[PDB]
Amino acid sequence: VSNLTVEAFEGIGSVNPMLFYQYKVTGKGKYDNVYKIIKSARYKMHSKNRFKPVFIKDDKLYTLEKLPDIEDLDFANINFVKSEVLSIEDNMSIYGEVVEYYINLKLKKVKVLGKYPKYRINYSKEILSNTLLTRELKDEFKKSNKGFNLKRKFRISPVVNKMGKVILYLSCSADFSTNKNIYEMLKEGLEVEGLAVKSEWSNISGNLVIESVLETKISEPTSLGQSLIDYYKNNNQGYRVKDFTDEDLNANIVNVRGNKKIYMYIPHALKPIITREYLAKNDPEFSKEIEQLIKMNMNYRYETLKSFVNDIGVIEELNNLSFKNKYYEDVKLLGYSSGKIDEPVLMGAKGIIKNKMQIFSNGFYKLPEGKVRFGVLYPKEFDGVSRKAIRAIYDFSKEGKYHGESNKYIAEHLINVEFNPKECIFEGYELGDITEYKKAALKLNNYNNVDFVIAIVPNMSDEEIENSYNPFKKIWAELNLPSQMISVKTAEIFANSRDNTALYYLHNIVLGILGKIGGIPWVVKDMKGDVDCFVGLDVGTREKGIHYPACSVVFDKYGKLINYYKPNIPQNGEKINTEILQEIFDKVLISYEEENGAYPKNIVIHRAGFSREDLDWYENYFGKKNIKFNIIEVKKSTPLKIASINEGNITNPEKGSYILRGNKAYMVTTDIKENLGSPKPLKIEKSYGDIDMLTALSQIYALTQIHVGATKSLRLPITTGYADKICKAIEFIPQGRVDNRLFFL
Amino acid sequence: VSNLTVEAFEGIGSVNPMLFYQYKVTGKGKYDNVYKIIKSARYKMHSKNRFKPVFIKDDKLYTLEKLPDIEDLDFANINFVKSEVLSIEDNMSIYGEVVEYYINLKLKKVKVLGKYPKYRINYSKEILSNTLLTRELKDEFKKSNKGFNLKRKFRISPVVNKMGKVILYLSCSADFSTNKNIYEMLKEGLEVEGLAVKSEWSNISGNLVIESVLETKISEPTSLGQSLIDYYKNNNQGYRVKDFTDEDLNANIVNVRGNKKIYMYIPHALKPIITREYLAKNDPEFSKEIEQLIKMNMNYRYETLKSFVNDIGVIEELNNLSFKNKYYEDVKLLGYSSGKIDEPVLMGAKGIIKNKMQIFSNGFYKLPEGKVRFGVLYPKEFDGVSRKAIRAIYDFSKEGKYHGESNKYIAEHLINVEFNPKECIFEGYELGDITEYKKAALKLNNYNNVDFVIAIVPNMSDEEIENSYNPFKKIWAELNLPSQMISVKTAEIFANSRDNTALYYLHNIVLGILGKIGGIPWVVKDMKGDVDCFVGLDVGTREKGIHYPACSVVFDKYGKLINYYKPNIPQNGEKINTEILQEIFDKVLISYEEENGAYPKNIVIHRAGFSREDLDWYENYFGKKNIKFNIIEVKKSTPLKIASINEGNITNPEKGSYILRGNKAYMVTTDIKENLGSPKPLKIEKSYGDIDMLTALSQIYALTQIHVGATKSLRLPITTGYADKICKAIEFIPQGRVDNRLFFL
DNA sequence: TGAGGTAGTAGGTTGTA
DNA sequence: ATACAACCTACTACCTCG
DNA sequence: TGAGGTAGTAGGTTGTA
DNA sequence: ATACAACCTACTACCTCG
Ligand SMILES: [Mn+2]
Ligand SMILES: [Mn+2]
Ligand SMILES: [Mn+2]
Ligand SMILES: [Mn+2]
C-alpha cells in the first residue's frame, strides 16, 4: 500500500552529553518573580554575549562555553553556579535547543550564489531563507520589480530521544516582506493614502493605518513642541536618525491612525504591510506567479526540505551530526501508526449513493413538510439577471430542469417549492443606505406569501456601495425566515453561462436551501463505534476582549443536527464556565430526550481547540446521569503536514488518511491533488475518553463527509465546523424558537 | 419655599499665592513615558520626604518647602528646576490639592478623648475617622465585641475660585473594617472555612476565598521547598515576619483560592473581608444597630460634616483659612440653579389618577387582547401555600377580590385572566437538580392551555437546595411564554397574612403580570418639551472581560415601550462601536415608523453613564435623515447629595427636586423620609443637544414616575433603568419575535 | 425572584498621556 | 510596569409600601 | 455572500510560573 | 513590566467543483 510519513529527518549519529555552564537568575527589580523575566533575561544575556548559546531549563540558564555573569542588567542579577555534564534523559528540551542552535549556526555560514547570505538567522526555531527552491529545483530569489519579497520560511523543531539520536521535524512556509518602506515609496511618488502599515522600529503589536501625508518636514518642529527627529533623539533612539542625509531630512511627516489617537511617525520607519491583497493590487503578475511556490504539494515540500537539510550538512559540534535527506519509509519507525479510514457510505432517497453528486439524481433523504414560497429581494439594476437566476434555481429545485432541458443527473421535485412568478413578489431595493435595506426586508415580510428568501446581495468584494448581506440576514434573523443569499456575480453566471459551472453553483445553492428549511439531504448508514450523540463546542475570539458565546451543536449518531444552543451571556475567555456547561449539556440531554425518549448512553464531545474545562465537572454531570462520555479535541491550525510514499515518490495523501500515536492523531480530511497545495490535516486528541482512537477518527472523518452544505466535504467535522459557522453567523441566529433548521449554512 | 443646597462649606478667607518649588521627571527606565510613572513618582518621593506635600501639574511636581531631588529611584530621575509663585487662575487643581493637603495636616493633629488619633490620614482626598458622630451628636467609637469596626469615611474635594476663595465640597460615608485577622480568629477558634479574605500585605486586587486550614505550621518547610516565613524573607519582606514570637510561629497554614491556583498564605496576613453579610451573620445586634448610622438623612449628614469642619478649624498655613459651619442658604451663591419639577400627571382607564395607588380602583390604560391562561409550577412541599397564593392573584386580577371580600380599592376585571383550577395545570417539581427544573418547565409547556406562568421558585436567599429562577426563566425565555416568578416567602405571606402587606405585594405582582403580557397600566398625559421618542442605552460590565451587549430601549413620547434591541455580538468595552449604533438606531427609527408612520422628528437619547461614542457618527446618521436629537447622559453613582432648608433645618428633599448649572444637573428622583437614608440623586448631563435642561430634567423625572413595574417610582428614568434591567435579564430575553411585552420586569 | 430605595463590601472600564 | 476619577457592575443586608 | 480547500498577513487567549 | 507554543480568529487573494 501507500505508507505514510511526516516531515521529519532522522539524524545519523547521536548527540553526546555536553559540558554545560549553569546560571542563576534572581528577581533583583521591584518584582521578585524570575518566571516573568526569565526568557527576557535569556534574550538580553544572549544578545550581549555575541549570540553565544543561552538556554532555559525551568530557572537555570545554560551556556556551552564560558561567559562572564552579568550584573549590568537592571532587572536580573545573573550569576554563575556550576559546570556539569547533564544527561539527555532528564533534559530532552535542552538538547533539542542545542541541536536547533547548532542548525542555526551552521545555516548562518551557508551562502547562495557565492555572495548572498542564504538564511536569515535570528537563532530561534524560525529560519527565514532569502532564496527559494523553485519547482524546477533551482535556488532563485523571488523579488518583484516593485520590491516585494517572497521568502521560504522554515521552522525547525528537533527532538532527541533518551539514547541521543536526533529526529528533526521540519515545516516550511512562505513569507511576504519588502525592502521598500514609505520613504522610498514617496520618493517614487506612490499613493499611500489608506494603507495599513507595520512600523519596523517598535515592537508594538497593533494595526496602524495611514491617515494622510502632511506637508510638514520631519526636521521642522512639530505640534508636540519638538521635531520628530528631536522626539526620537529624546527617546534614546538617535541611532535610528543618525545616518540620515539631508535628503532623508526632506521627508514628509506621515500621520498614522493608531487605534487610540493619530500618531505622527516618520516615513523611514514605516514598512507597508504585505497582505495578499497588497500583492494582488500592486503586482498581480507576481502575485499570480507565486501560487505555485506558496501552495506546495508534498513533493515540492519534500524537495524544499531536502534542499534545507543539504544546506545543513554535517554539524561537527555534535559528534559529526548529519541528517538524512529522505523521509521515513513508515512512521512505525517514528512511533506513530498509520492507515486509511474507510469511506462512510451515505443514504439518499432511494438508497446508497456512490458519491455526493448522485443525490440530485437520487433525491434527498429527509424532505421538509409543506410548500416553501420563494420571495426575493434583488437590486434594481439587476432585474433580468436576478429573474434568470431564480428561474434556474426554481428549475433545479422544483421542476428538475436545467437550461430548459430535463437532465439525467437531476430528478424532479427536489424541494416542494411553491414559486409562481405571476403570484410571487420580486421586491427591488435601492443599493445604498442600510436602513433602506432593512426596510426592504421588512417590506418583503410585510406579506404572508413567503416562507423562504433567495435575496440577491451585491458582491462581498467591491468595497463600494454598501453590502446588503448583514442587514438582510439581521432582519431575516429577527423575523425567523430562512434565506439563501446570492451575490450578483453568481446571479450573472446563472444568467449568462451555458456550462456546468452554474450546475455546480446551483448544487450548492439547492443544498443550502434544503438545509435552511429543515431538510436533511444525506445521512450515514452506520456510524462506527458505540455512540448516541455528538456534541460540538467552540469559543472563538472575534477581536480583543470579544468572545463569541459558547455555541454548541448537537448531532445524533446518524449525523443530522438535533439542537444548537447559544448562551446569551458572553463568557470570559475560551475556557467555558460550569454554568454555561450546565446550560449547554442540559440542552443536549433534553433535546436528545425529546427526539428519542431517553438520555443518550454515549456522548462524543468534539471541542474545537483545547478542552480547558473542569474534567471534574464532566465526571460529576455525566456520573450523576449514568452517561459514558468522550471529549475529543478537534484542532484546526497545525503546522504538521502528512505525506505518502510509492517507491519513494512523495505525494499528497488521500482524504481519510491518518497517523496515530497514543492519545493524539493527525488525519487528512480532504483530497487535494497536486498543483493546489498540501492537505492541512486536523490535530485530533482525546483529553478524556474510553474509546479507542481508530473509532474516534472514523467518527470525525464521517462527520467531515456529511457536510450538508456542499457537494464537497468539509475539512472540519461538522461538530466543530458547525460550531465555527454559528460563531461566524453569531448575529444571524433566527429569533424564533430554535429548530433543526441549519440557518447558518 | 424650601431652598436647596449641596454638601459644601464656604471658606472664610482666601488662599494667597504660595512659593512653589518645581520639579522635573524624565523616563530613566527602559520605558520613556513620564505619564505612566508620574503619579507613582509623586507617591514615592512624597513618602520618602517625611510626607511633605508633593503635587502634580501635568509633568511638573511641586513642593511647598525645600526637598533634595532624588536619584535613588530606579525609574524616575526627579530634579529641581526652579522656585516660583504660581497664580491661582491657571492652577485651580494645584491650589485645591494645597487646601486638601493642609486639611489632612490639620486633621492629623486632632485627637478624640485626649488620647486617640481621631482621623486616619493618608494625605489624600479620603479621611477615615476612627470615631463617629452619633445621632445624639456625641463622638463615640463604634466597635463590635467581635472586633468589627465602623468608621465614618470622609471625602474632601475643595475648589478654589479665580480670586482665591475656597469652597469645600464634602461627602461622608461609612466604612467596615476589623482589627482581627485570621490569626486572632484561629486563636479564638472560629471557623473560617469558605470565607472570603483580603490579604493586607499585597496590593493585588482580587477575590480570595479560603479553602481550608492546614495542620502544617508556617515555620515548617512547605510544599514549595521552603517554609512560608523563608518565602517572605526571600521576597525582601522579612520585616513583616521579624516581630513574630514563638506563638506567632505556631500558626496554621491557611491555603486560599486565588482565581488561578491555591495560594498558601500565612494567617497573620489575611484580614477577613467585612461584607454586610458578614456583619449580619456574626454580630446581628451590631449589624442592625448601625442602620441608623450608615443610612444618613440630610440632617445627620449636616451634623457629621459640621463636626468634621469644626475638627478642621483654622488653617494658619493658608492666611488663617477657616471654613463656615453651615451650608449655603441657596446654591445661586454657588453658581447652581434650583427648583422642583412639577409632578407628571398620569392616565388610567377612566381618567387621571392622583397617585399610582388609585389605578386598581380605576383600571389600567391599555389592556392586552385575549385571555391569558395561568399555568403554575410549584415546589411539591408547598402545595396549599401555592394554591392560596394563586387564589389571591386570581382574585386580584380577574375577580377584583381580596381575601374573599370585594374591596373598594380594586375594580373587577383588571386583566382578562382565564384561570379555572378545575381545568388548569398545577405542575409540581422536585426541588433539586437543575435539569429536573428545565424538564418541569418544558413539561408545563407540553400543553397548549397556558399563556402565562406564575411559577413559585424557592427563595433567592437560603443557599441550600438549588434555586429555580434561572432555569425556569431560561426555558420560558426559549419558549416565549412570559412568567411572573414568586418566591416561597411571598407565597407564604399570601397564604398566611391577613393585612394589607399582601395587598402591596399583590399590587406589584399584578403590575408585573400586566407588563409581561403587553399591557400598559398608566401613561403620561403630556410629556414636557418637543420630543417624539426616548431611546435608552447602557453597556454593563458583568465581570472581568465581560460586557453586556448594548441593550437599548425605545419609548414613545407618552412613555410606553416600543422596542428593545440586544445585539447578539458582545462589544469591546462600554464604548459602542458604530456598527452596533447603526443597528440600534435602525431598530429605533424603523420601530417608530412601524408604530407611527414616519421617522421621529426628535429623539432624546438617555445614555447610562458616559456617551463615549463618535458624536460625528450621530451627526451623520441624524443629519442624513433630518432628525434633531439629544444625548442626555443619566449617571447613577454620584457621591454628591442634595439637601433642603426651612429656617436652616436641613432635611431630605422631595422627589423631583433638582439643582442645575449649565450642561450638568443633579436631580432627586425619590422621596425618602428621615430614618431611611438620604436621597441619592442622579447626575444628568447633556453631552449633545439643543434643548434646555429644565425640559430634559422634566422628561427624565417623568420617565421615573412611569415605571410600570411597581406602585413606587424608579430612581432611574426607565430608559436607562429598563436598559439596566435588560442587562440584568440578559439571558432571559424571550426567544421569539421581539414584542412590546416588558418581559424583564 | 412582589417592588423599590438606601447602604456596605469587593471588582472592572475608561479617560488622562 | 502605574493611579486616581468618575463612572460602572454584583452580591449581601435593612427598610418600607392605602 | 454558491460551497469548500489551501495559502498569506495581521492580531488575540492561555498555559507555563 | 515578559515570551514563546499551541492554539485560535479575520480579512484578502487563488483555485476547483460530473
Ligand atoms: Mn472557532
Ligand atoms: Mn450560506
Ligand atoms: Mn448599566
Ligand atoms: Mn419581576
PDB file of C-alpha atoms (C1' of nucleotides) and ligand atoms in Angstrom, chain A residues 538-540 608 636 724 727, chain F residues 8-9, ligand 1:
ATOM      1  CA  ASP A 538     -16.241  26.191  20.181  1.00  0.00           C
ATOM      2  CA  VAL A 539     -15.484  29.570  21.712  1.00  0.00           C
ATOM      3  CA  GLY A 540     -13.997  31.949  19.156  1.00  0.00           C
ATOM      4  CA  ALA A 608     -12.672  22.911  18.915  1.00  0.00           C
ATOM      5  CA  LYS A 636      -7.527  23.139  13.168  1.00  0.00           C
ATOM      6  CA  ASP A 724     -17.497  27.562  13.923  1.00  0.00           C
ATOM      7  CA  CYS A 727     -19.693  31.597  15.593  1.00  0.00           C
TER       8      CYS A 727
ATOM      9  C1'  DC F   8      -7.266  30.416  17.696  1.00  0.00           C
ATOM     10  C1'  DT F   9      -9.658  34.226  14.826  1.00  0.00           C
TER      11       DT F   9
HETATM   12 MN    MN G   1     -13.708  28.628  16.485  1.00  0.00          MN
END
